[PDB]
Design a protein. Structure first.
Length: 327
């Protein structure tokens, strides 16, 4: 129908609208090959254009883009289960991304279309089971957070919600890892002194994430977020450490490696006055770990001895830690 360079944006719009036509990859895969290819081409064209030429990029093309994304991406998901529509969706995501981070981007213009409802429909998508979709969503929400001051609170509050239902209500997610990476970056940007709502979020939501059985899928990102709280406000270290010692697997187990890991990362940046408050209960847990029957645990606990910082902490508080290092 159309032809790919005769100046105008009138045909650039026409290409975007061509790409709102949605194809069936799931029931019939041998279906509409020729046209899937036209669409899947026009996307691949539209990426190059936006990612190599400059001022195209005008009031009129902002809604076309945002509709184009929404019509392709905002849909109910299947029952690791990969996306059949990836030949299209990859380029949809690649495009939007390059569009959001284009140097000609006017957030002040895109805010009429990328609104609170848009964000909500994006967050739903994080429950996809296709990891490289969850990867594009991560980066995308991150760009949206960074460039739309008007949406930051809303995004923060909605992420909090997804963690809430993941833990208390039945609902599972498997996009927690990705959302927590976005949270790490949100935490770095909080004003000091920390608003109380963030301190509540830490004790009421972040710390309890250490308890859901699928911890291992997101634990490094969980660890990063807790450590970042403590870098903002070391006054939180006591309840945080005690929470981890509370949720510490009381049965001997190989997931203990992850707690040892996280504790060493807290210990890496701990304040001396904060350490003394938790050293006794902390080192009693390590006593157990050193003598674990699970080889990996003893070793991981024993590896603290390579940490010069921890060794000097032990050494500054020897009178009180020594009796705890075997009787």
């Amino acid at each position: 129908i159309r032809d790919v360079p005769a100046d105008q944006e009138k045909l650039f719009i026409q290409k975007l609208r061509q790409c709102c036509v949605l194809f069936d990859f799931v029931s019939d895969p041998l279906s509409d090959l020729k046209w899937k290819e036209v669409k899947r081409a026009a996307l691949s064209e539209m990426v190059e254009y936006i990612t190599h030429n400059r001022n195209v990029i005008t009031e009129p093309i902002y809604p076309e883009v945002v509709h184009m994304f929404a019509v392709n991406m905002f849909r109910t998901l299947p029952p690791p289960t990969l996306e059949a529509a990836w030949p299209h969706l990859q380029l949809v995501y690649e495009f939007f991304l390059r569009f959001l981070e284009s140097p000609d981007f006017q957030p002040n213009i895109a805010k009429k279309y990328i609104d609170q409802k848009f964000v909500l429909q994006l967050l739903e998508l994080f429950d996809s089971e296709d990891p490289r979709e969850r990867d594009f969503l991560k980066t995308t929400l991150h760009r949206i957070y960074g460039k739309f001051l008007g949406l930051r609170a809303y995004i923060r509050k909605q992420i909090n919600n997804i963690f809430y239902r993941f833990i208390y209500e039945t609902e599972h997610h498997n996009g927690i890892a990705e959302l927590l990476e976005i949270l790490g970056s949100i935490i770095n940007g909080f004003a000091l002194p920390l608003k109380e709502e963030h301190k509540i979020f830490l004790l009421k939501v972040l710390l309890p994430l250490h308890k859901v059985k699928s911890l291992s899928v997101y634990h490094p990102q969980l660890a990063y977020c807790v450590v970042q709280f403590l870098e903002k406000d070391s006054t939180l270290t006591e309840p945080v450490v005690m929470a981890l010692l509370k949720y510490w697997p009381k049965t001997h187990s190989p997931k203990e490696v992850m707690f040892l890991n996280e504790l060493e990362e807290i210990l890496d940046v701990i304040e001396p006055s904060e350490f003394v408050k938790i050293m006794e209960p902390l080192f009693r847990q390590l006593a157990k770990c050193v003598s674990s029957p699970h080889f990996q645990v003893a070793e991981r606990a024993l590896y603290y001895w390579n940490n010069e910082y921890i060794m000097s902490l032990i050494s500054d508080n020897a009178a009180k830690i020594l009796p705890i290092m075997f009787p």
